[PDB]
Design a protein around this ligand. Sequence first.
Ligand SMILES: *[C@@H]1O[C@H](CO)[C@@H](O[C@@H]2O[C@H](CO)[C@@H](O)[C@H](O)[C@H]2NC(C)=O)[C@H](O)[C@H]1NC(C)=O
Ligand SMILES: *[C@@H]1O[C@H](CO)[C@@H](O[C@@H]2O[C@H](CO)[C@@H](O)[C@H](O)[C@H]2NC(C)=O)[C@H](O)[C@H]1NC(C)=O
Ligand SMILES: *[C@@H]1O[C@H](CO)[C@@H](O[C@@H]2O[C@H](CO)[C@@H](O)[C@H](O)[C@H]2NC(C)=O)[C@H](O)[C@H]1NC(C)=O
Ligand SMILES: *[C@@H]1O[C@H](CO)[C@@H](O[C@@H]2O[C@H](CO)[C@@H](O)[C@H](O)[C@H]2NC(C)=O)[C@H](O)[C@H]1NC(C)=O
Ligand SMILES: *[C@@H]1O[C@H](CO)[C@@H](O[C@@H]2O[C@H](CO)[C@@H](O)[C@H](O)[C@H]2NC(C)=O)[C@H](O)[C@H]1NC(C)=O
Ligand code: NAG
Lengths: 98, 595
Amino acid sequence: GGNYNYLYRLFRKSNLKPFERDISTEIYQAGSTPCNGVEGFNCYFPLQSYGFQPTNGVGYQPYRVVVLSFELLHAPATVCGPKKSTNLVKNKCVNFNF
Amino acid sequence: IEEQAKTFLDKFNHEAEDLFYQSSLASWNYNTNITEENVQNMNNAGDKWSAFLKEQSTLAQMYPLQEIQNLTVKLQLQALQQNGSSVLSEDKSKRLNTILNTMSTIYSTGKVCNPDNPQECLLLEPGLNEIMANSLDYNERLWAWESWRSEVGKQLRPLYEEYVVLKNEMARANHYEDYGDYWRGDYEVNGVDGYDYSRGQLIEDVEHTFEEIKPLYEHLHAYVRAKLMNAYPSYISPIGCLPAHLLGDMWGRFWTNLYSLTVPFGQKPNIDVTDAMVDQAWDAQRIFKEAEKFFVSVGLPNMTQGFWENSMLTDPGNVQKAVCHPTAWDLGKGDFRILMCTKVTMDDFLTAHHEMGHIQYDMAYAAQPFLLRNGANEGFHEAVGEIMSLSAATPKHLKSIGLLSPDFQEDNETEINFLLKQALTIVGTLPFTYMLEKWRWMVFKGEIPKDQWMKKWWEMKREIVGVVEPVPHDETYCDPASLFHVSNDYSFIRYYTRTLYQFQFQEALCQAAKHEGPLHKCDISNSTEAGQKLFNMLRLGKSEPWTLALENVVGAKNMNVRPLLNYFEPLFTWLKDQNKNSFVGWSTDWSPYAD
Ligand SMILES: *[C@@H]1O[C@H](CO)[C@@H](O[C@@H]2O[C@H](CO)[C@@H](O)[C@H](O)[C@H]2NC(C)=O)[C@H](O)[C@H]1NC(C)=O
Ligand SMILES: *[C@@H]1O[C@H](CO)[C@@H](O[C@@H]2O[C@H](CO)[C@@H](O)[C@H](O)[C@H]2NC(C)=O)[C@H](O)[C@H]1NC(C)=O
Ligand SMILES: *[C@@H]1O[C@H](CO)[C@@H](O[C@@H]2O[C@H](CO)[C@@H](O)[C@H](O)[C@H]2NC(C)=O)[C@H](O)[C@H]1NC(C)=O
Ligand SMILES: *[C@@H]1O[C@H](CO)[C@@H](O[C@@H]2O[C@H](CO)[C@@H](O)[C@H](O)[C@H]2NC(C)=O)[C@H](O)[C@H]1NC(C)=O
Ligand SMILES: *[C@@H]1O[C@H](CO)[C@@H](O[C@@H]2O[C@H](CO)[C@@H](O)[C@H](O)[C@H]2NC(C)=O)[C@H](O)[C@H]1NC(C)=O
Ligand SMILES: *[C@@H]1O[C@H](CO)[C@@H](O)[C@H](O)[C@H]1NC(C)=O
């Protein structure tokens, strides 16, 4: 029957700055005529909804996306990979790191 | 301003794709599982699509059309701004729909009763089509031909006269001169630097291409006439026209039921691979999987993998009421389904290749906007489907796909049997199609007044087609309206141009696949360069003029009849030797009653 809860914005005045976010819901104004908060020609609601349905060809089915962004300000340190600890071979001239 | 029209169409392109989807998804559930709780499920979901489109149509006239520069956004705007009906008065608009419903139910429910038994009565499709396709009795074919026209066609005569007046009013309010000029608006092309095409230019290109088929059609008409005199002696003149009730069906549209009387060498079996399919235990799925391997052989994509679950390749395991008719569906959102009830036969092995060709055409232009997702004209869509069927019916393809003894010998006697069966369907329908649209074009513009409709109809049968009526018909009959496409408001010139595009595509693809022999032995398997020649047209849609689409495959800007004649030159050479003692041509003075 269509999952109409997943919307996207399809009209904006100007492209986003990187990592900028815009949840407003003002009536878009395409033409020169002012809109006064009501719909009509050249006065469009700015949000559309994917109507997802299970019998959609691939490329029409929902994909979930996660974007990891590693940043490095100027602190002293922070999270990082794990670690691999070898074994202790006591009783032999060895090259060690503790 | 033009940038407001672009923002108009993108709201259209995302409300339409969803509303067209579920209006076509509900039509799938009715077609594959019939209840009445599905017919009411598709009538309200069908009307939400139609009510939405007239709301956006009346919004489209706020933008002018000549203040636009981009050709693509102009093409989308003109296809949506089209008024069509609704230009009439609101009491004339309901009179036109009453006529179209009355003419459609006369054709489907009209009955003919026997004069020896008035309690037995036949409909057209069960019983009257079987007499015209199977009988060899002269008196029974003459009864079924005349009684369908005198009992059903006489009811359509006062309805078709009122239909011409109301359709000419609707066409002249949309700035055409008549309704025939409205039908020729499909082939019109406006201002794309050298690829233009006028709506009156279609009339000369049909008549210029037709006078090069008349040498080939005259030798086919003379050979069939000489073979019909053995089947009906004392009924056919050796220098005259053919009687209209001895042609294989009700209207003489196809001559394909005359093959058992006109076969050149009846002691050679025409090749039929149906027994080799049931000897290797081929299921329902093998016929499509070998069809998918044909298309991936030429360089075309696989099926979409939603194609295999959602489709219904047979009638179900339930005794399930579901219109069983081969077709290809394009519901939207990249969801392609094929609906057919396939049996293990070489017939449905071939129409599997035909119906998959509609899918591969549909998968290619799916990146265009919504209003340009059709064929480039009305004739391209069926023509791409039938060059897939011609390449799969060759014995060269059948012995490499595993279905013919590697020790098979094709002789020159079986190629004549195959080519003559093709010419009874291809060449035999071309003067019928040309004559019928020429008659309907002259009726709409008024060159034929209504006191000469049936006079000019039968003069054009004797002169163009070479077919004479067995009983004289005055102006109380309407013999064109007894055909389906005339009484159900359909255009008929799409069957003429599709036949010419089909051999232009096939000859252009076989020069790219490096063929060496005759054109009728060709196969485009294992190539890649031919598929690249085909794919460059398939992805255009309606975004380009159709004359620009033809040069991407053929290399010309117009339809041409010389590739059609090259297909039939082995038959045309053999036909001119069988008509050394015959008379080629016909007389328009002889009649089967005029002695
Ligand atoms: C034809 O399809 C309809 C709906 O798709 C089927 O009707 C009902 O479908 C619902 C599912 O929403 C089931 O819960 C009901 O049991 C179905 N009705 C009945 C009477 O079974 C319908 O069954 C389908 N036709 C056939 C012959 O199965
Ligand atoms: C108007 O025409 C231009 C070219 O005549 C189209 O521009 C192309 O647009 C697509 C995507 O919109 C780009 O990927 C191409 O690179 C553009 N081509 C050029 C040469 O810049 C434009 O799409 C047309 N307008 C619409 C609404 O389709
Ligand atoms: C479509 O039909 C209308 C008549 O219903 C034609 O006249 C238009 O009338 C409307 C008002 O109902 C005006 O807004 C339009 O300006 C009129 N036509 C235009 C745009 O000049 C109209 O001409 C028809 N449109 C077509 C496709 O020719
Ligand atoms: C099929 O090919 C054979 C072999 O050439 C043809 O037989 C020849 O026919 C001509 C004309 O009748 C004769 O002059 C030759 O002598 C025949 N050849 C032999 C070896 O006898 C035959 O006519 C061809 N059939 C068709 C339908 O084209
Ligand atoms: C055309 O394509 C078919 C399908 O790939 C080729 O058929 C193969 O032929 C070889 C030897 O003739 C066999 O060993 C393979 O088993 C066949 N494959 C299949 C899937 O049946 C065929 O050879 C190709 N034609 C040419 C000239 O390369
Ligand atoms: C098409 O599908 C077959 C298996 O079904 C696969 O082997 C082949 O690689 C596919 N074609 C392409 C171009 O990936």
